[PDB]
Enzyme design. Structure first.
Site, PDB file in Angstrom:
ATOM      1  N   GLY A  20      59.367  31.136  12.606  1.00 25.41           N
ATOM      2  CA  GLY A  20      57.977  30.916  13.124  1.00 25.41           C
ATOM      3  C   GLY A  20      57.431  32.841  13.155  1.00 25.41           C
ATOM      4  N   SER A  21      57.232  33.132  14.052  1.00 22.08           N
ATOM      5  CA  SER A  21      56.334  34.662  14.307  1.00 22.08           C
ATOM      6  C   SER A  21      56.951  35.772  13.587  1.00 22.08           C
ATOM      7  CB  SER A  21      55.642  34.768  15.346  1.00 22.08           C
ATOM      8  OG  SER A  21      56.803  34.843  16.497  1.00 22.08           O
ATOM      9  N   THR A  22      58.441  35.885  13.521  1.00 23.48           N
ATOM     10  CA  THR A  22      59.300  36.669  12.980  1.00 23.48           C
ATOM     11  C   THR A  22      59.115  37.243  11.406  1.00 23.48           C
ATOM     12  OG1 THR A  22      61.164  35.573  12.645  1.00 23.48           O
ATOM     13  CG2 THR A  22      60.857  36.477  14.802  1.00 23.48           C
TER      14      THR A  22
END
Length: 301
Positions: A56-58
C-alpha cells in the site's frame, strides 16, 4: 546473530500488547540497522510467521523519488489532486491540490498515480526493484497497473523485503542486503538513488508523524520520524477482497540522522477501527520509542 535481545525483547512486548489491544490475529516487526543491514529484531506475536501482503502506502515515497529524479516534479511542486477515472481514483479527502509534502502527509493516491502516469512503465519497476522489491531476502510481476503499483496494489512483499526498502531510505539510498549475522561498521553497499533525493523525501515523510498526517499516533516526543502507515483488505486465494485487514507502518528514525528502519504489521485487527489506515501506527511508535531510548540516541526534535 545480528539480533539485539534487548531490542528483540521490547519489540516482542509491544507486539503482544498491540495484538491483544486490537484483538488481532497476529503481528510482526522487523528492526534493521540502516547503516549495516543487520536485522536487530525480527518477531511474531501468536511461533506465527511473516507472510506476504500488499505494501500500500509505503511504496509512495519511492514514486516521488523517481519523479524528482526524472524531473517530472521539483522539490516545491504542487500537484492537481482532483480525483479521476480509468475505475475511480480518489483519496480519504478531496483536495484540488497538494504539495509533494502534502501528498505524503495525506497519503494521496490520486497524486502518486499522476506521477506514475507521467513516467515510463519501467521507471517504477526499476526503482522498486532497486530498493530490492521482487527480490528474495535469503535469511511482484497499463496505467491501471502503473497506477495501483504507485500506491502499492497488485503487487505483494514480505515485512522483510519492505524492511530492506526502508533501510535503503535511511542510508539515503545505499542498498545493502539484510543480515542475520553481526558485521563491523561500515558496510559498503550499492548506490541506487542520489543521496540528495532520498534526504528530500525523508524530510517530507516527517509530515506523516505530525498533526494533519495519517501517521500522527506513531509520533514520539523528542524525535523526528519519517514513516508510512496504511492498510490492505486481505485478498482470498482467489481475487475477491476479504473483510480481513493488514494494518502496517514503516519508517526510519531519527529523521535528521537515520539509525533504524522499522516495519510493523498487525494482521486482521477486530477491535476499534479494524480497517483504519493507522491501526499499526501506535505500536510502531511504542517500538521505535523504546529502541531510540534503549540505544541512547540523542533527541532529534
Amino acid at each position: 546473530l545480528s539480533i539485539d535481545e534487548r531490542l528483540q525483547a521490547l519489540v516482542y512486548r509491544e507486539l503482544n500488547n498491540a495484538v491483544a489491544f486490537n484483538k488481532a490475529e497476529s503481528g510482526s516487526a522487523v528492526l534493521v540497522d540502516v547503516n549495516t543491514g543487520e536485522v536487530l529484531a525480527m518477531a511474531n506475536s501468536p511461533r506465527t510467521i511473516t507472510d506476504v501482503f500488499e505494501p500500500g502506502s509505503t511504496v509512495k515515497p519511492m514514486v516521488v523519488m523517481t519523479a524528482l529524479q526524472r524531473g517530472v516534479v521539483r522539490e516545491n511542486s504542487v500537484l492537481n489532486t482532483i480525483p479521476y477515472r480509468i475505475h475511480e481514483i480518489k483519496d480519504v479527502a478531496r483536495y484540488s491540490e497538494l504539495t509533494l509534502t502534502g501528498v505524503l502527509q495525506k497519503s494521496s493516491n490520486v497524486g502518486v498515480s499522476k506521477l506514475a502516469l507521467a513516467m515510463p512503465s519501467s521507471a517504477l519497476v526499476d526503482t522498486y526493484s532497486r530498493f530490492g522489491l521482487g527480490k528474495a531476502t535469503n535469511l511482484y510481476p497499463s496505467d491501471i497497473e502503473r497506477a495501483t503499483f504507485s500506491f502499492g496494489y497488485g503487487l505483494m512483499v514480505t515485512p522483510l523485503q519492505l524492511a530492506r526498502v526502508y533501510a535503503t531510505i535511511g542510508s539515503y539510498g545505499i542498498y545493502r542486503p539484510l543480515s542475520i549475522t553481526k558485521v563491523d561498521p561500515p558496510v559498503p553497499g550499492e548506490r541506487v538513488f542520489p543521496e540528495s533525493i532520498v534526504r528530500t523525501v525523508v524530510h517530507m515523510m516527517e509530515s506523516v508523524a505530525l498533526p494533519g498526517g495519517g501517521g500522527v499516533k506513531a509520533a514520539i516526543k523528542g524525535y523526528r520520524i519519517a514513516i508510512k502507515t496504511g492498510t490492505a483488505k486481505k485478498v482470498g486465494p482467489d481475487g475477491r477482497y476479504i473483510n480481513k485487514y493488514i494494518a502496517y507502518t514503516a519508517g526510519v528514525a531519527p529523521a535528521s540522522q537515520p539509525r533504524f528502519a522499522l516495519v510493523v504489521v498487525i494482521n486482521d485487527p477486530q477491535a476499534g477501527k479494524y480497517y483504519g489506515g493507522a491501526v499499526s501506527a501506535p505500536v510502531f511508535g511504542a517500538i521505535m520509542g523504546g529502541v531510540l531510548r534503549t540505544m541512547n540516541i540523542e533527541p532529534d526534535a
